[PDB]
Amino acid sequence: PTSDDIFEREYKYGAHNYHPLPVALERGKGIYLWDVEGRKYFDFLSSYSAVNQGHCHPKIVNALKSQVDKLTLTSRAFYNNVLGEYEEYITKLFNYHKVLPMNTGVEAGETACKLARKWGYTVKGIQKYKAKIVFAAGNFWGRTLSAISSSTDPTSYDGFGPFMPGFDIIPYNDLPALERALQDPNVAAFMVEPIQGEAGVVVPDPGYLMGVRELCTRHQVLFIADEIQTGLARTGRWLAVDYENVRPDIVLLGKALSGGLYPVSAVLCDDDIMLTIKPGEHGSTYGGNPLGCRVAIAALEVLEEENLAENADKLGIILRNELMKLPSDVVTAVRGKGLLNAIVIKETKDWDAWKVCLRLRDNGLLAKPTHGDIIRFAPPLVIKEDELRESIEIINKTILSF
Amino acid sequence: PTSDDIFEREYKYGAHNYHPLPVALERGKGIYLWDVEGRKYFDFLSSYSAVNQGHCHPKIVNALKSQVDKLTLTSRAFYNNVLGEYEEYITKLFNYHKVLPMNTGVEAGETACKLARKWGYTVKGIQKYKAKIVFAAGNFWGRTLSAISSSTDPTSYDGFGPFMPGFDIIPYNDLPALERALQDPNVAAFMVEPIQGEAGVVVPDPGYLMGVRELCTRHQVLFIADEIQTGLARTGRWLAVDYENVRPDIVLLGKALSGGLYPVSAVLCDDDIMLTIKPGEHGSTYGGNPLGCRVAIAALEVLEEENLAENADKLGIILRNELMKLPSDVVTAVRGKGLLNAIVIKETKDWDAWKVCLRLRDNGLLAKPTHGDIIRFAPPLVIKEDELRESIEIINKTILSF
Numbered sequence: 074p075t076s077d078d079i080f081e082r083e084y085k086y087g088a089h090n091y092h093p094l095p096v097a098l099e100r101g102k103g104i105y106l107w108d109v110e111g112r113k114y115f116d117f118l119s120s121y122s123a124v125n126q127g128h129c130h131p132k133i134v135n136a137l138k139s140q141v142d143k144l145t146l147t148s149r150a151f152y153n154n155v156l157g158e159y160e161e162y163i164t165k166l167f168n169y170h171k172v173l174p175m176n177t178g179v180e181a182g183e184t185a186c187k188l189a190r191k192w193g194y195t196v197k198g199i200q201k202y203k204a205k206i207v208f209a210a211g212n213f214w215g216r217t218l219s220a221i222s223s224s225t226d227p228t229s230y231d232g233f234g235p236f237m238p239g240f241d242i243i244p245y246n247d248l249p250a251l252e253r254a255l256q257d258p259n260v261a262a263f264m265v266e267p268i269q270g271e272a273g274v275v276v277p278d279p280g281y282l283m284g285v286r287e288l289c290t291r292h293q294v295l296f297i298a299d300e301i302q303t304g305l306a307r308t309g310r311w312l313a314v315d316y317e318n319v320r321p322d323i324v325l326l327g328k329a330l331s332g333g334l335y336p337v338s339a340v341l342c343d344d345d346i347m348l349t350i351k352p353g354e355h356g357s358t359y360g361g362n363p364l365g366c367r368v369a370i371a372a373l374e375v376l377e378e379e380n381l382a383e384n385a386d387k388l389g390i391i392l393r394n395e396l397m398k399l400p401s402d403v404v405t406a407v408r409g410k411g412l413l414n415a416i417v418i419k420e421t422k423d424w425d426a427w428k429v430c431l432r433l434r435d436n437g438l439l440a441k442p443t444h445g446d447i448i449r450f451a452p453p454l455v456i457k458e459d460e461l462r463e464s465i466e467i468i469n470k471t472i473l474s475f
Numbered sequence: 476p477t478s479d480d481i482f483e484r485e486y487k488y489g490a491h492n493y494h495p496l497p498v499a500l501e502r503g504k505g506i507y508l509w510d511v512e513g514r515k516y517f518d519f520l521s522s523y524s525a526v527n528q529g530h531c532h533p534k535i536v537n538a539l540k541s542q543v544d545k546l547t548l549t550s551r552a553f554y555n556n557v558l559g560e561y562e563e564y565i566t567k568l569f570n571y572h573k574v575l576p577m578n579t580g581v582e583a584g585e586t587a588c589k590l591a592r593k594w595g596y597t598v599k600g601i602q603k604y605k606a607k608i609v610f611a612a613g614n615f616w617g618r619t620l621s622a623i624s625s626s627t628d629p630t631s632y633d634g635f636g637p638f639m640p641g642f643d644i645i646p647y648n649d650l651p652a653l654e655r656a657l658q659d660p661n662v663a664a665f666m667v668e669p670i671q672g673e674a675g676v677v678v679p680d681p682g683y684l685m686g687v688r689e690l691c692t693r694h695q696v697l698f699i700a701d702e703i704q705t706g707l708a709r710t711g712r713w714l715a716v717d718y719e720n721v722r723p724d725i726v727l728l729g730k731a732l733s734g735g736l737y738p739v740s741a742v743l744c745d746d747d748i749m750l751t752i753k754p755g756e757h758g759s760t761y762g763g764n765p766l767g768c769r770v771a772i773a774a775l776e777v778l779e780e781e782n783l784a785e786n787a788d789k790l791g792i793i794l795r796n797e798l799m800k801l802p803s804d805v806v807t808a809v810r811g812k813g814l815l816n817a818i819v820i821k822e823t824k825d826w827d828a829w830k831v832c833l834r835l836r837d838n839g840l841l842a843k844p845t846h847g848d849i850i851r852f853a854p855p856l857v858i859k860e861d862e863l864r865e866s867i868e869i870i871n872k873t874i875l876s877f
């Protein structure tokens with residue numbers, strides 16, 4: 074049951090919606106992954122921050138194992154005993170009054186859009202159905218029809234039927250564009266990533282988040298912060314927005330929310346927003362099921378108890394400094410916060426990000442290329458400094474091998 | 476930590492998007508649920524068919540426990556060893572060439588809509604972006620903006636911003652309406668439930684599915700069968716559509732696909748449809764992760780090995796006959812297939828479905844009301860005949876108590 078057999082089998086029986094890096098994992102623990110040949114790799118993607126806590130963290134594993142013997146899903150037609158414990162926990166952790174639980178990140182984004190529209194019509198007073206939601210170019214929040222209706226990436230939306238109206242797009246990291254867009258009284262919300270992940274770890278300028286908060290407040294517009302990738306210690310704070318002491322109106326969480334053990338996502342906001350959705354008006358079969366809730370409690374507890382945000386801050390400083398010591402001839406840019414980082418290489422035709430990642434794979438490190446000139450470096454947050462310096466030397470060997 | 480404490484806690488810290496039946500479960504096993512007071516109930520909802528295999532089925536539990544120690548999520552940037560095994564398994568089980576794995580049922584529906592639109596533009600030749608998808612009134616396939624854009628239930632779509640264009644609605648169980656709708660050359664697909672679940676277990680007339688298949692083929696329109704609730708033995712066949720030997724172009728699976736242990740959904744179709752989506756054009760973080768795949772393999776195996784479809788067929792015949800022995804003065808209708816059934820009561824003001832379900836709860840049986848006059852009866856498929864007859868007597872006691 075080799076790696077090539079796995080590639081071929083998936084090519085035969087599975088959709089071709091991905092072209093993954095040709096490596097076939099079968100075990101994961103902490104910062105490490107093992108393929109079916111027994112080869113060991115540093116994971117420098119962390120499943121897009123879903124395993125911030127490392128792969129198969131034993132406390133989250135134990136929470137899942139303990140709960141799976143009791144009860145896993147009643148549906149929301151009845152109550153289960155776990156959901157409320159988790160809701161109190163996560164709301165008090167992030168100091169929002171309420172949470173709406175969902176499963177995937179895009180379901181959290183859709184929930185946020187529905188909340189913004191319902192609030193805009195029933196509270197702000199926009200006429201049905203004139204509500205607009207503003208997004209930043211380069212945004213990524215999933216693959217539903219709506220989500221790709223706000224994309225600026227043609228691969229996401231081209232050929233996928235007519236698009237959700239009411240979505241306007243402005244440049245990222247651009248306060249004057251936001252002010253100009255918010256002159257429109259029918260804007261109900263602005264949704265933005267504090268750091269754009271899929272776009273290539275694009276870090277906006279100091280003050281951007283503060284200005285977004287001020288503009289949204291001034292024009293009674295909801296500030297939706299998509300922290301599904303940037304949150305939960307990955308950038309060195311509980312929320313990337315904490316770097317500028319900014320309180321969004323809606324915060325979206327996911328991925329690391331379960332440590333990779335279960336699709337859990339969360340929409341956090343206060344009553345004046347959350348309660349515009351009445352009973353029967355929104356939900357999900359698996360949303361708030363007790364199994365996901367137990368593992369999400371454990372995953373948040375791991376993040377707090379092992380102080381992973383402080384570790385991500387320190388080791389990210391180290392990582393970026395070392396990466397900046399790479400030649401300007403070859404690495405065009407280094408950027409990121411905490412342990413969410415990326416490099417931009419000087420792509421030729423002899424040489425692109427895909428080849429760099431193939432060779433990183435050869436040398437024991439797994440990283441994702443994002444367009445042909447960007448490579449993300451994002452190891453799990455439980456990585457130690459010596460493991461990080463070994464990985465950095467793998468990166469150096471690989472980059473200078475060309 | 477009583478039941479009222481649980482209600483109050485969720486009301487304080489959680490969104491109010493549900494009004495559940497006031498019962499607080501903490502354990503589930505097979506056909507039974509236990510609340511925090513230790514009271515025992517028959518589950519006659521089965522989490523909308525997600526626990527067809529019963530709550531916490533030990534083989535699915537063991538699959539989850541075995542896999543969670545190995546690897547739970549690499550993301551689709553790399554390969555994992557499990558996904559292909561599951562894809563071969565489920566494609567050979569349902570005799571479709573390929574499966575696209577997702578997490579929730581609505582993600583499967585959105586994937587199906589995107590496939591229909593991409594196929595309609597790139598294969599059928601519809602001009603961008605004129606593709607239409609036809610739905611039946613009473614349809615339910617989730618809570619995204621798109622999904623509610625095709626709803627006829629005002630509680631689903633009212634107040635939720637402008638709607639996805641390209642979605643047309645025709646009456647359910649209505650072959651002439653489908654023929655008239657399919658005169659439009661720009662229709663790419665018709666999506667329909669073989670039995671409408673959320674609408675109140677509406678069973679279309681014999682021959683409806685056959686006529687839908689013939690019409691879709693005649694007008695080169697894709698037949699999307701939503702079997703997320705009706706599939707996986709709940710109606711007495713592997714697929715409800717098997718009752719009429721009908722092969723849809725796209726089949727949607729979910730819920731029971733994991734036995735309730737993990738959000739797993741599947742989109743099944745052949746190459747000429749599936750491969751219109753190219754690498755990079757669709758996906759999901761958790762879609763096809765190895766943990767969900769292991770439990771989905773185990774859940775399908777449980778359905779086959781315990782012959783749960785045959786059991787559902789036999790016990791559903793028994794259930795409907797006994798329910799039809801209830802007074803016409805009180806039970807207006809009985810309907811369903813296999814163990815997906817519902818009754819319609821003669822609602823007054825002294826008396827509605829909500830009160831009937833409160834009293835069923837009092838007498839040890841948990842059922843969901845769906846509008847105020849419909850109550851679903853849908854126990855897990857591992858129920859035995861004697862347990863079923865005890866439950867039927869609970870139903871009789873309750874209905875005749877009024």
Ligand SMILES: Cc1ncc(COP(=O)(O)O)c(/C=N/[C@H]2C[C@@H](C(=O)O)CC2=O)c1O
Nearest residue numbers: 177178179213214215271301302758759760
């Ligand atoms: C900031 C943000 N918001 C929402 C979502 C959606 O969450 P999801 O619906 O996947 O669970 C994501 C998801 N990012 C991912 C997932 C992935 C793939 O789709 O393969 C590649 C990628 O960049 C996100 O980064």
Ligand SMILES: Cc1ncc(COP(=O)(O)O)c(/C=N/[C@H]2C[C@@H](C(=O)O)CC2=O)c1O
Nearest residue numbers: 356357358579580581615616617673703704
């Ligand atoms: C036929 C069919 N297709 C797709 C979906 C969506 O799957 P999902 O996104 O929830 O996982 C469902 C979901 N039915 C449910 C879920 C539920 C609630 O939303 O509370 C009440 C209800 O009737 C379905 O019955």
